[PDB]
Design an enzyme around this catalytic site. Structure first.
Site, short mmCIF file in Angstrom:
data_model
loop_
_atom_site.label_atom_id
_atom_site.label_comp_id
_atom_site.label_asym_id
_atom_site.label_seq_id
_atom_site.Cartn_x
_atom_site.Cartn_y
_atom_site.Cartn_z
CE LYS A 72 -12.89 -0.69 -3.53
NZ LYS A 72 -12.52 0.17 -2.39
CG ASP B 28 -2.08 1.05 1.01
OD1 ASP B 28 -1.79 2.22 0.73
OD2 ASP B 28 -3.25 0.67 1.14
#
Ligand SMILES: Nc1ncnc2c1ncn2[C@@H]1O[C@H](CSCC[C@H](N)C(=O)O)[C@@H](O)[C@H]1O
Ligand SMILES: [Mg+2]
Ligand SMILES: [Mg+2]
Ligand SMILES: [Mg+2]
Ligand SMILES: [Mg+2]
Ligand SMILES: [Mg+2]
Ligand SMILES: [Mg+2]
Ligand SMILES: [Mg+2]
Ligand SMILES: [Zn+2]
Lengths: 224, 1182
Positions: free
Chosen positions: A147, A66
């Site tokens: 996503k 991340d």
RNA sequence: GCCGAAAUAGCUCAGUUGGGAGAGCGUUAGACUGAAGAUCUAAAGGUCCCUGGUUCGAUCCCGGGUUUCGGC
């Protein structure tokens, strides 16, 4: 809603965990997955789900990455960096010589502004980076969950994704806000092009990076 | 409330030297008046003053006692402020003095005013100016006085204005003093204009000679007016008023009157010849000649030109018409150059005024002007362009002025084409057709069409398209278009009715009217969708029923039939008929129309129909039936037995309504019913004591039984496990009962008292409503308990109250995150009813109930503070068990909640409140130091999650407590403490690096910053600007190694900047904004330096926030274009961060420019604007 | 018959002084994540009961009126 509560009640770092679980019971993602890659996990809820569902065996290896920092988990290795940058891509792929990951998940999103065209643009960039990582890592016939932001025009993304995968499906779990336009593309059966290395590639790669059709163009009239 | 009259001490002996013990003279009346406190009998004696003077019209020479009496009256009058009605009282009284006594009163009041004018205190000037203002309005005593003292009053005004200007330029830095000085300037200018307009001395020339003192004072005043007009650091009201005054004086002082329009014209065009104006004009108005005046100066000068000249009757003639056209030209030139918002509003007002003046001129103008002012002229074309460009401006004043301009344009054309044969003018028809091409979401379409309808009549619009009423009704399902559609439809059918009652004179016309306006309405009411039904009922149907009440009979007969045919079939039109009938009947009853008939009719409503409506599936039908029963036109009409039974039936089932709007409407209607019961019970009681109907005592008994049973139902609705809506509704209605029947406590009779129906157990349940998880229920229960009488310890013994206090103390330290709210409400309840135990008196060292609540608050706060100090020390020792056993945020929350209830500005035990505040600040800082490192970093039978909960909750509570303490108006708070608080907020909110302490600190910092703005101490109100500068020069040399983080949209820096910019007075000056935007736009511009990326990043991160804040709002428009450029130019930068920031900022700019989305999906054209509007608002983007 | 009170946004209520009409609730829109989204934002909705005046300008000053009431 109710899952914002259930995230705090249970041992889930965020409500997003319930989006992953609700995608198993409808697509059977965790069939035989042993090593999986987690992209864009802010607190690590998806990493937690993967660790508890794969690393519960003990040999499961999970790599999470991340832009920000995360609280460490037992059985998951954390990387901080922009997956758009090539260095982060290289250090991610560094973890997968030999045995390739069976599953790659990507939960990333830009700072969602509210008007949806810019969100599609930014999400397209992030998905291109995630797809690059996937094709560079996961084993053929594998799984890629990502996503997406379902707006007015989603045909191009589906077209691009269909090239690399046998099946592409668009799902909206129960935990996803009904007002939100987010959704998840589940990609079953990684089927990379025959001449593709991380003929056919000359037509596919330009089209996947952007909707580039400058491969069917010709300087003479087309054959019949 | 009135102010007691006062008098000069040394006047006493003066009025004692003429007083008499017998009391025959007016002097004794003055003695009696002055030695009083009530400002009411004084007024009576003031009336009787006149007969006392009237009863001595025989002497032929004023009595010295009467002389001194009137002198003291004058002195008192001149010492009375304008906020005191007694001032106007004695003004009116002395207005009626007998004619014999006028000369001496004249001379002596003149002397008093003259000696008043010689004051030299700067801050006493406003009182003198107010006195001069009063002596002008309907006060014959002072009018002659000021008419005799023109030289002196003019000299005083001039010197006062000069001195106020000097003081204002000297008091720079403090803005409260500056605001007061500007107000003084404004009153001075307005008084001067009043004097010039309203003194019977300035007529004729009679004083234009250079040697006249009046002339020289007038020239000095004119020079001051010009100087203040050209100034730019003053309020714009002052400058605009100055422009008005300048034009008024020029009109007054210029001897060749016929040359006034020409001269002014040149002044507006900046083309005045310095060699042809009179010498006094050059001496006084040097700025007006010889060029170089701002655009505001010209704007205000043309405003004054329109306002202060005689346009009617054609006094100014051809030169006046030329001046009108020149003013139009100048205004249009300024329209393209002005970009400041307030100046744009001023320009709109002035354009509307220009249209008014054009109306007045055009009523008797020359034929030449007709060609240049008709609807096809260039001027009217430019005006229509302005209107089309501006009807959807964000500022409301702009839009209202555009409506005025459009109406006046149509009137101008009508005046120009009075030589008309047939009514529909080609210009009007073309305008109508062009307007009908717009979409139905364009809000200006409605207003423009309304004006056109009143111009040409609705029959022509209907001839063009006869489905327009239906088209307008179809958009009525969208709120925020409902008001415009309703107004347009109302204009349309009013005009149509007026048109049908024209030449065709019979009674049948109504039929056509009905089928045009009522039949579509009935169809919508019966078969429209839910939102459309609600909005048509709420907004449109009342207008139609009010305008034509005789249409109700028509609607009912149509609906009743559709009801009965339903029973024939055992259709949708037959299904929605009941709801439509109830809506019509509710509207009719509430307006007192023909349906005002003692249980709502003899036969319109039956028991079955009402019961069906009251319980219908659609919320709207239930609300309309309840409103039919509850609300009536007459506020004291008797509630019948049938209505009581129906209301009990309704209450049984409608306490769990889920729509907050529906629930609120239900509660409001029930409150109206209770008010009706209360107000008619008084009438019944009056008839009862006055020794068909039913012997009002019977009705009073029925009222008592009804209210008791309603309370029984409401208290039954508080069973264990009851929903949130049912507790909300029950507590709301109970509170409404407690409020409504608490009226006649100063009176003698009351039909019902809620306190009588409160048992011990009902009190227990009301207190237990403090444990509900919803704060609305806690608040409602608290309010209701406070409204009751004899409740504190009447219902509770000492032991159980001690148990309650122990319970609150235990809830203040529980690990559950929301128990502290319950503890706070319990503690506040114990405080505000003096139910604390006796041991708490041991914490402080020693009827005004404020004093006792303050003492209770002090005691409980000291107890909480002792516990908190111990817990914070142990947390310093080890944070694990602190998160496990005694998290510290509960006590902080309880302390803040206790303080929140007090009036911090009016404490009384400052000797006790100072050390407690010091200790409070110290412990806040200690706790913050303990728990912050855990919140920036990661974790250091206790999970880490509960540690994080403890830490960030403590952060939030400390921030809120500091924001609360900042409202002590630093005194109990020293300047060093305020500086330390600001430093604390700056250390967080810029080094948090985490989401926590970004929005956590922002609320407290905003509270502190607003207080800092309002503070009168100069050393404090300069803090926000200094902090802003510090953070800006921190931004420039960011040095990416710093603690500032780029993620989470920025390192809280946007929150810091937003809070600092919030201090600026609303619409007051906004000077911090100009500096900040200049610096940020400069930073975000392209940079050759590679290292200069980070200053370019933060700027785009800050700018984004600034472009979506609601406070900055319309002050941010003049920067949009620049910001837009930056975003676009930042989209091509090689660096990724600059492009991402550009994307986010551009999103914010799009939302700011085009507005929030109007519907969920389609976005057909709801968020688009024409090219003309976009490139008129931001012409530098084309 | 005199005397006095009230009328502001869909609803409930604020509005010293003459210079852009204030909030709460409801409604609309937005939000990938934490820290009850039970949260945050930002929009929308009025010309102040009606009607004449005074004023450059009126919710505010002055005079009539309407509707609903209180007192004698
Ligand atoms: N370019 C980028 N590289 C890496 N992570 C990114 C990124 N853009 C966005 N992200 C990440 O996308 C995430 C958005 S929300 C992530 C939710 C998280 N997966 C969960 O389990 O709840 C954040 O973690 C953000 O850091
Ligand atoms: Mg936090
Ligand atoms: Mg009020
Ligand atoms: Mg709201
Ligand atoms: Mg608005
Ligand atoms: Mg006038
Ligand atoms: Mg008016
Ligand atoms: Mg009466
Ligand atoms: Zn000159």
């Amino acid at each position: 809603d109710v899952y914002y509560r259930l995230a705090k009640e249970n041992g889930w770092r965020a409500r997003s965990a319930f989006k992953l679980l609700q995608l198993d019971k409808e697509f059977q993602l965790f069939q035989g997955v042993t090593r999986a890659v987690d992209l864009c996990a802010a607190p690590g809820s998806w990493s937690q789900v993967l660790s508890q569902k794969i690393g519960g065996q003990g040999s499961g290896h999970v790599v999470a990455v991340d832009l920000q920092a995360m609280a460490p988990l037992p059985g998951v290795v954390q990387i901080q960096g922009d997956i758009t940058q090539l260095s982060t891509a290289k250090e991610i792929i560094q973890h997968f010589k030999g045995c390739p990951a069976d599953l790659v998940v990507c939960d990333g999103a830009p700072d969602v502004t509210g008007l949806h065209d810019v969100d599609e643009y930014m999400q397209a960039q992030l998905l291109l980076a995630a797809l690059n990582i996937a094709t560079h890592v996961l084993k053929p016939g594998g799984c890629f969950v990502a996503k997406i932001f379902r707006g007015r025009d989603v045909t191009l993304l589906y077209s691009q994704l269909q090239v690399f995968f046998s099946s592409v499906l668009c799902a909206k779990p129960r935990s996803s806000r009904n007002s939100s336009i987010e959704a998840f593309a589940v990609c079953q059966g990684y089927d990379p092009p025959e001449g593709f290395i991380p003929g056919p590639t000359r037509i596919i790669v330009p089209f996947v990076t952007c909707g580039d059709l400058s491969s069917y163009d010709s300087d003479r009239s087309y054959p019949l | 409330q009135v102010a007691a009259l006062t008098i000069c001490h040394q006047d006493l002996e003066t009025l004692k030297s003429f007083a008499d013990v017998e009391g025959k003279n007016l002097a004794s009346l003055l003695l009696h008046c002055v030695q009083l406190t009530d400002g009411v009998s004084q007024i009576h004696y003031i009336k009787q003053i006149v007969p006392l003077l009237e009863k001595a019209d025989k002497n032929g020479m004023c009595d010295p006692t009467i002389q001194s009496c009137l002198d003291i009256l004058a002195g008192i009058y001149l010492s009375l402020s304008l906020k005191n009605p007694l001032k106007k009282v004695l003004a009116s009284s002395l207005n009626s003095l007998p004619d014999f006594f006028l000369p001496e009163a004249m001379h002596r009041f003149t002397s008093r005013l003259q000696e008043e004018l010689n004051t030299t205190d700067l801050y006493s000037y406003r009182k003198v100016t107010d006195n001069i203002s009063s002596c002008m309005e309907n006060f014959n005593l002072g009018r002659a006085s000021v008419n005799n003292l023109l030289k002196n009053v003019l000299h005083f005004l001039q010197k006062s204005l000069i001195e106020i200007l000097e003081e204002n330029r000297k008091c720079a830095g403090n803005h409260i003093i500056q605001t007061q000085l500007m107000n003084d300037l404004l009153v001075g200018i307005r008084v001067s204009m009043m004097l010039v307009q309203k003194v019977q001395d300035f007529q004729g020339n009679l004083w234009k000679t250079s040697d006249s003192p009046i002339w020289q004072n007038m020239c000095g005043l004119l020079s001051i007016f010009t100087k203040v007009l050209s100034d730019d650091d003053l309020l714009q009201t002052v400058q605009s008023t100055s422009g008005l005054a300048i034009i008024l004086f020029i009109k007054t002082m210029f001897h060749p009157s016929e040359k006034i329009p020409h001269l002014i014209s040149s002044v507006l065009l900046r083309s005045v010849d310095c060699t042809s104006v009179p010498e006094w004009f050059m001496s006084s108005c040097r700025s007006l000649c010889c060029g170089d005046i701002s655009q505001s100066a010209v704007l205000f000068l043309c405003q004054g030109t329109l306002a202060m000249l005689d346009w009617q009757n054609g006094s100014m003639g051809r030169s006046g018409e030329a001046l009108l056209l020149d003013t139009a030209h100048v205004l249009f030139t300024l329209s393209s150059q002005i970009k400041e918002p307030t100046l744009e509003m001023f320009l709109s007002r002035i354009l509307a005024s220009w249209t008014n003046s054009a109306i007045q001129v055009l009523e008797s103008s020359s034929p030449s002007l007709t060609d240049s002012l008709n609807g096809n002229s260039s001027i009217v074309g430019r005006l229509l362009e302005y209107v089309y460009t501006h009807w959807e401006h964000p500022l409301d004043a702009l839009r209202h002025q555009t409506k005025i301009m459009f109406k006046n344009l149509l009137q101008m054309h009508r005046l120009t084409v009075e030589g008309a044969d047939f009514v529909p003018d080609p210009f009007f028809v073309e305008l109508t057709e062009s307007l009908l091409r717009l979409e139905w979401h364009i809000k200006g379409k409605y207003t423009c069409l309304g004006c056109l309808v009143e111009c040409i009549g609705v029959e022509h619009i209907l001839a063009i398209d006869k489905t327009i009423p239906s088209q307008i009704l179809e958009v009525m399902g969208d709120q925020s278009l409902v008001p415009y559609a309703s107004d347009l439809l109302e204009t349309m059918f009013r005009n149509h009715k007026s048109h049908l009652k024209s030449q065709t004179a019979e009674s049948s016309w109504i039929d056509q009217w009905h089928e045009t306006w009522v039949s579509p309405l009935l169809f919508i009411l019966c078969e429209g969708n839910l939102d459309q039904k609600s909005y048509v009922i709420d907004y449109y149907l009342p207008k139609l029923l009010s305008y034509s009440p005789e249409s109700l009979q028509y609607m009912v007969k149509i609906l009743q039939t559709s009801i009965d045919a339903k029973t024939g079939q055992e259709s949708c039109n037959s299904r929605g008929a009941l709801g439509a009938l109830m809506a019509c009947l509710r509207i009719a009853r509430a307006h007192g129309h023909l349906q005002s008939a003692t249980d709502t009719w003899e036969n319109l409503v039956s028991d079955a129909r009402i019961k069906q409506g009251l319980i219908h599936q659609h919320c709207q039908v239930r609300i309309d039936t309840l409103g039919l029963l509850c609300e009536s036109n007459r506020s004291t009409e008797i509630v019948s037995m049938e209505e009581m039974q129906w209301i009990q039936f309704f209450i049984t089932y409608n306490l769990n309504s889920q729509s907050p709007g529906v629930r609120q409407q239900i509660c409001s209607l029930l409150k109206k019913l209770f008010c009706r019961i209360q107000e008619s019970s008084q009438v019944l009681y009056k008839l009862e004591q006055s020794k068909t109907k039913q012997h009002p005592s019977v009705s009073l008994q029925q009222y008592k039984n009804f209210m008791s049973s309603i309370c029984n139902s409401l208290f039954e609705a508080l069973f264990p496990g009851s929903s949130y809506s049912t507790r909300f509704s029950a507590l709301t209605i109970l509170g409404s009962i407690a409020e409504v029947f608490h009226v006649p406590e100063g009176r003698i009779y009351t039909v019902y008292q809620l306190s009588h129906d409160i048992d011990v157990g009902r009190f227990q349940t009301l207190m237990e409503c403090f444990t509900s998880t919803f704060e609305d229920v806690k608040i409602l229960a608290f309010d209701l308990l406070m409204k009751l009488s004899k409740t504190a310890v009447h219902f509770q013994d000492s032991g159980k109250l001690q148990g309650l206090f122990q319970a609150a103390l235990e809830l203040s330290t529980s690990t559950k995150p929301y128990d502290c709210v319950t503890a706070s409400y319990l503690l506040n309840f114990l405080i505000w009813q003096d139910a604390l135990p006796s041991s708490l008196s041991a914490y402080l060292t020693q009827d005004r109930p404020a004093a006792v609540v303050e003492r209770n608050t002090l005691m409980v706060i000291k107890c909480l503070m002792e516990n908190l100090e111990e817990e914070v020390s142990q947390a310093e020792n080890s944070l694990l068990q602190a998160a496990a056993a005694f998290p510290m945020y509960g006590r902080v929350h309880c302390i803040t909640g206790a303080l929140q209830k007090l009036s911090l500005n009016s404490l009384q035990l400052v000797s006790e409140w100072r050390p407690v505040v010091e200790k409070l600040l110290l412990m806040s800082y200690r706790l913050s130091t303990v728990v912050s490192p855990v919140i920036q970093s990661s974790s250091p039978d206790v999970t880490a999650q509960m540690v994080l909960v403890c830490c960030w909750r403590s952060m939030k509570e400390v921030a809120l407590l500091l924001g609360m303490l900042c409202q002590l108006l630093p005194g109990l708070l020293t300047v060093e403490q305020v500086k330390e608080i600001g430093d604390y907020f700056k250390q967080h909110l810029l080094q948090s690096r985490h989401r926590g302490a970004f929005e956590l600190a922002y609320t407290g910092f905003v509270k502190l910053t607003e207080v800092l703005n309002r503070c009168p101490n100069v050393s404090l109100q300069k803090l926000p600007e200094q902090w802003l500068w510090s953070v800006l020069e921190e931004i420039k040399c960011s040095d990416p190694s710093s603690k500032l983080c780029a993620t989470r949209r920025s390192a809280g820096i946007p929150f810091y900047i937003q809070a600092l910019l919030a201090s600026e007075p609303k619409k007051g000056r906004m000077d911090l904004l100009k500096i900040t935007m200049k610096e940020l736009i400069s930073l975000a511009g392209p940079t050759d330096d590679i290292q200069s990326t980070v200053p370019q990043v933060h700027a785009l991160n800050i700018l984004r926030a600034l472009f979506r804040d609601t406070r900055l709002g319309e002050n941010i428009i003049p920067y949009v274009a620049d910001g837009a450029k930056a975003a676009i130019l930042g989209f091509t930068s090689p660096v990724w961060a600059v492009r991402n920031s550009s994307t986010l900022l551009f999103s914010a700019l799009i939302t700011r420019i085009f507005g929030v989305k109007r519907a969920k999906d389609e976005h057909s054209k709801t968020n688009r604007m024409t090219g003309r509007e976009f490139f008129s608002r931001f012409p530098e983007l084309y």
